[PDB]
């Protein structure tokens, strides 16, 4: 179950942002975005950015 | 506020246990900034340091998953168990502070049932707090908290537990003294006036040893308060006088509006009006200086009652003020004072009316609670 802020990260991912662009948009370090995705992807049980986008959309 | 910072650290921990990185990072940052703008107590600084370390552990356990294919990655929920298992002492300490600070926050929000529930969880984690002085400090804080919630028996019980530990150390005579103050104020709520006095006297002798002006003064004041509560007005005067002298020699401005108030009122009640007037003038001035909102109105009230007729319209505004502030105990007491003023003046209709006000006030919900998720 994603927090609203984690969903926000995913929303930016779905729009095609890069990690750096997500960092800048949310005032987090890029490293933090990387950690966030590792956590988020694990939670969605996916192994890729593209595939996280798909499970997101369902 | 120390209390609000601790609760933010609590929220931080909840996000950490969930591995919600953005949330944890935002709180981590906001908490660092807030603590950089204050001299936090030792307990709060330690809780933060623990949580900072725990946050880094969160990141450290997540790091290996980056290079793992997804099917080779453990569920986060299991990662968490591993962390708690390999860091049992950290976890226990975190549990202690989390619950202690949440409890303090709930108490602050006047959520009493909720505060007790967290205080009990904290106490069950006290085994992780090695230093026996730190344990005593917990018991001491519990005592103060149940004094405030008026669970008088539990307040004394915790004061006793704290006292027992302080008694075994020599450098803690001040805390011992304050345990005596805790016994005394509790005895006072129980109407055990002689017992209260006796403990205030003990506390006094100890504060005099430690050459502690503030405590010395408060102790003397409390004795006068006990005398006053028994309507032994003449007997209270010398104690209020001694307390004032102590407060005034040192420059303990904050304590002075109060130290002057009861003694002012007493002289009104005793019909010593020129003396009342002088105490009044001085007490009023001290209150003006310290910028003490409450005592300004209370000194004002003395005039409204004892000199002004009485001035019932001004008295009524004052009563409303107190109530809006939830100073119910004082409100009851002042209404009684008004009733009694009229009674001695043989104005029984007016006395009866204020005695009725007293009962109305005693009917207010003064510390209501709410059950958590219990069905009706
Ligand atoms: Mn600081």
Author numbering:
A (entry chain B): 153 to 210
B (entry chain A): 6 to 381
Sentences from the paper on this structure:
The complex interplay between the response regulator ComA, the anti-activator RapF, and the signaling peptide PhrF controls competence development in Bacillus subtilis. More specifically, ComA drives the expression of genetic competence genes, while RapF inhibits the interaction of ComA with its target promoters. The signaling peptide PhrF accumulates at high cell density and upregulates genetic competence by antagonizing the interaction of RapF and ComA. In contrast, genetic and biochemical results show that a subset of Rap proteins, including RapC, RapF, and RapH, are anti-activators that bind to the response regulator transcription factor ComA, inhibiting its interaction with DNA promoters without affecting its phosphorylation state.
To begin to determine how RapF inhibits response regulator binding to DNA without affecting its phosphorylation state, we solved its X-ray crystal structure in complex with ComAC to 2.30 Å resolution. The crystallographic asymmetric unit contains one molecule of RapF bound to one molecule of ComAC. RapF consists of two distinct domains, an N-terminal antiparallel 3-helix bundle (residues 7–72) and a C-terminal tetratricopeptide repeat (TPR) domain (residues 92–381). The RapF C-terminal TPR domain contains seven helix-turn-helix (HTH) folds that assemble into a large superhelix. The RapF-ComAC X-ray crystal structure reveals an extensive protein-protein interface that buries a total of 1,845.7 Å2 surface area. In sum, the RapF-ComAC interaction buries six of the seven ComA DNA binding residues. RapF-ComAC contacts are mediated only by the RapF 3-helix bundle and linker region. Thus, the RapF-ComAC X-ray crystal structure reveals that ComA binds to a RapF surface that, at least in part, mimics DNA. First, RapF buries ComA DNA binding residues in the RapF-ComA interface, sterically blocking the binding of ComA to its DNA recognition elements. Second, RapF binding allosterically weakens the ComAC dimerization interface, inhibiting the formation of transcriptionally active ComA dimers.
